Ligand binder design. Structure first.
Ligand code: NA
Ligand code: NA
Ligand code: NA
Ligand code: NA
Ligand code: NA
Ligand code: NA
Ligand code: NA
Lengths: 179, 181
């Protein structure tokens, strides 16, 4: 779904760069990638030079993604992306997941983390309140972090005003192309 | 052996507090078993950052050693009383970062005292939490749970960790990080 430019970019940069430590060559899975946050995430991932794996909910959205030159475009309405990506990666998986999918997608996305992997949950507390995670799934230096941008902005508005200026400098100096 | 011990302690504490934990000035960090090698590396790096340091240790003499370092709190690493104790001391706030090497009930009780935005860093080997589970509602206020296995990390990315250890040592050589004993 849509998000304003400031929400989309703050969410995607805090999630991929600060929490997710995304670095060149790493494999990132961005669910719902045609949405506001998803496209900010694909724009940032391209700046960093990560390998980009995506999903979306319609043929037309998926077609828009195949045109961006990414490694993988799967269906956000199914959990088939997990096996598809393991197949594609010869068992590696991905280094960071930026998740906005509900239910089985959370467990499957945690399952396909590589060693050192970072799972970032953007869903509302609703989505995972009942859910539990087995800590054995994080043992190979992996992590699970929730990002609630509304809360973060409420608690640290100065820090996020500064981060927005930082991100926009990258736009102004041509480092970050807004897609 | 001495050079290696120091590199493991400092790589563990710096990757955990600075890279994974994003520790920043004035944040509250809980360092368990703070008189151990990694624990002391983390106290030293927390002092460099200007965090507010909460600690535990397992004897009276080790607790006294920590009280002499000038930290906010020294509690018992063999009890889960620290969780209530720190909530009382911080008037309900809890802590921003937990650097955990305790097994058992201390893992759930340290996750419960994370502030919003809090980061729990688990240093135990896998056998410590192999059948442990975490309700994800516990992470809802922008919180996170990260395992750090430095042995694994060194196998996987040796050049990156060589660069990090050089950075740390340069910081110490230049007086920016004081190694505490
Ligand atoms: Na705009
Ligand atoms: Na979609
Ligand atoms: Na799918
Ligand atoms: Na695992
Ligand atoms: Na205990
Ligand atoms: Na914070
Ligand atoms: Na949440």
């Amino acid at each position: 779904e849509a998000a304003t430019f400031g929400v989309a970019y703050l969410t995607a940069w805090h999630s991929l760069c600060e929490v997710g430590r995304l670095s060149p060559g790493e494999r990132v899975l961005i669910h719902s990638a045609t949405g506001g946050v998803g496209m900010a995430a694909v724009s940032i991932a391209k700046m960093i030079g990560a390998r980009i794996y995506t999903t979306a909910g319609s043929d037309a959205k998926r077609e828009m993604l195949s045109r961006l030159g990414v490694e993988y475009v799967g269906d956000s309405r199914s959990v088939d992306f997990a096996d598809e990506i393991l197949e594609l990666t010869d068992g590696y998986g991905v280094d960071v997941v930026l998740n906005s999918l509900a239910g089985e997608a959370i467990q499957r996305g945690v399952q396909i983390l590589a060693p050192g992997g970072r799972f970032i949950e953007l869903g509302k507390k609703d989505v995972y309140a009942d859910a539990s995670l087995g800590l054995a799934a994080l043992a190979k230096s992996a992590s699970f972090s929730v990002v609630d941008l509304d809360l973060n902005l409420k608690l640290q508005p100065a820090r996020y005003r500064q981060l927005l200026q930082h991100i926009l400098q990258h736009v102004a100096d041509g480092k970050l192309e807004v897609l």
